[PDB]
Design a protein around this ligand. Structure first.
Ligand code: GV1
Length: 291
């Protein structure tokens, strides 16, 4: 799977909000482009003159994520974050010259990402009460990954002492994206656990935080809620469910070639962090069949 790389695998089956610190600093921002940020302004002007209803929005930038020594007390993860925008993304990661910017960043800064917007995404492995994961079909008319399978998620917009409010907005945003797109009541959802961070090598290395969320509704009840919104209540064109039993071998199925990179990252992290048992009971051959 060359189109996805794991930047972080969380310990303990995944980290709760109270175990994560953020450092939000202009030191974590994108570097100005070698020939100046005028190249970004030119791309944006061209795009607005074709689609004048488009609007910019601020985004969090991922710089890096450092895990504490395993089994330690105190905070277990430090997220180093900067600020970026939808405009900066379109002028860098989604530029035809994104690979040239990666080579230039390695040369100038020893950092393939130094000249890239790298907005932070969020995604969920969302499990039902009857042990299925939730999948969504992307419209064939959108610019990114048209017609591919996705999981719930989005790119959160900004509004340890500004730190804790930023971690709160990251965890909040994955629940809000489930309520907005799947049409589920907030009180049916567990507090999220962070599973890890995956990079999309087809989008010049932009990263998504991948979370596990449990719903108290069955697959049948989730479907009813999604469909009862009607076609204008969701960006996706359909919903479907795979038993958690069968998610274990999803990379060996024909579904795998239809999954967008960030959904592949969610499923790899679910399998490594929530699946893959370590104890004698769940690891016994009848409960963990070989092959
Ligand atoms: C990585 C991001 S941030 C962002 N903000 C607003 N719209 C977007 N779309 C739908 C193109 C994006 C994408 C793909």
């Amino acid at each position: 799977d060359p189109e996805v790389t794991l930047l972080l695998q969380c310990p303990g089956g995944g980290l709760p909000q109270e175990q994560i610190q953020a450092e939000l600093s202009p030191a974590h921002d994108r570097r100005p482009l070698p020939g100046g940020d005028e190249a970004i302004t030119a791309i944006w002007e061209t795009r607005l003159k074709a689609q004048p209803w488009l609007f910019d929005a601020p985004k969090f930038r991922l710089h890096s994520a450092t895990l504490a020594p395993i089994g330690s007390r105190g905070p277990q993860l430090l997220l180093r974050l900067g600020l970026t925008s939808y405009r900066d993304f379109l002028g860098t990661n989604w530029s035809s010259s994104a690979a040239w910017l990666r080579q230039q960043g390695a040369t100038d800064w020893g950092d393939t990402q130094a000249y890239l917007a790298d907005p932070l995404g969020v995604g969920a492995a969302l499990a039902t009460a009857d042990d299925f994961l939730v999948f969504l079909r992307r419209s064939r008319q959108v610019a990114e990954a048209p017609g591919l399978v996705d999981v719930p998620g989005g790119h959160p917009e900004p509004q340890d002492l500004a730190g804790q409010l930023v971690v709160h907005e990251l965890f909040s945003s994955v629940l809000q994206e489930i309520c907005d797109e799947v049409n589920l009541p907030l009180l049916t959802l567990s507090q999220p656990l962070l599973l890890g961070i995956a990079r999309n090598e087809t989008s010049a290395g932009r990263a998504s935080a991948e979370f596990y969320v449990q719903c108290s509704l069955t697959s049948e009840q989730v479907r009813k809620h999604y469909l009862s919104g009607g076609p204008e209540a969701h960006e996706s064109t359909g919903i479907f469910f795979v038993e958690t039993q069968n998610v274990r071998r999803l990379p060996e199925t024909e579904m795998w070639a239809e999954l967008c990179p960030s959904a592949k990252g969610a499923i790899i992290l679910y399998n490594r962090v929530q699946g893959s048992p370590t104890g004698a009971a769940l690891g016994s051959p009848a409960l963990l069949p070989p092959l």
